[PDB]
Amino acid sequence: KTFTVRIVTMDAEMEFNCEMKWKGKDLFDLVCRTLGLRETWFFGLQYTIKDTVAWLKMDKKVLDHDVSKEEPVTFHFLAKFYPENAEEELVQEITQHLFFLQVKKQILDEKIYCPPEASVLLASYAVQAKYGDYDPSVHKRGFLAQEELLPKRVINLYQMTPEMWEERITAWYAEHRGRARDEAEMEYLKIAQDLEMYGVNYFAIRNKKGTELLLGVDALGLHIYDPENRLTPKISFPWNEIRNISYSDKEFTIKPLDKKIDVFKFNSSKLRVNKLILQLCIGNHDLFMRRRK
């Protein structure tokens, strides 16, 4: 027989009937062809188990994942990996879009820190993409009054009524005259991708001494943060500078390239988190090496 599966993208939703023997590879390919997306390697189908995200493996049966079996079996089609340079690597317009949406959401949900002024400029572009050029005759007062525009963190740092923000944003919106949709979303991407937290996968760890720290994985390398400060890593290890990383019983070891360097060792208590880090390290490292050829 078959089961139903729900695939949620940032944009939309879709349903599929799947044979009981279907693997990750089968769903993934199906979703990608539907989207007409060829740049598939930034993506993956994720689901959350316990409090940890999980990505469907290609060669395992879908149902052999510890995912809630209550039909429809739901997966989110999200980006697993970020390019080092959006404008250069996101060739297909559909790839651009999906990234844009997913990034804007992380900015509004405050998963990515974003200074007040950047939040405004971003908004003015998010607005241009959704609305097209600004027509003063068409776009009248309060035409943005029901729109998530800025992170809450930003709104309550100022003595400003929502209408004033919307006036600020409109002022910059007007400057984006003549800018096509994909032009705007990419402007958004170009700004957002310089945000210090953009594209960084955080994890709680602690070192040999047992003091609590944060691990950060992204397109550039592995990073170590003081739990209070996520903007600036205390230590960075670029991919080209790492021989490899080893995992062994809730312990990782970053084995640097220069034998000169001391190894870096840290601990994480959750197994599921650990597999995730390991996947993320491998894939980010791969893509990094691929760019360099």
């Binding site: 200074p115 002024e117 950047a118 405004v120 740092l157 100022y158 003595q159 600020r168």
Partner: peptide
């Protein structure tokens, strides 16, 4: 980068209304 100036102009105009 090329947004330095827009970011600065924006930051400067918000500054008067920042929380005490």
């Amino acid at each position: 980068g090329p947004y330095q100036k827009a970011l600065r102009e924006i930051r400067y105009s918000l500054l008067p209304f920042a929380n005490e």
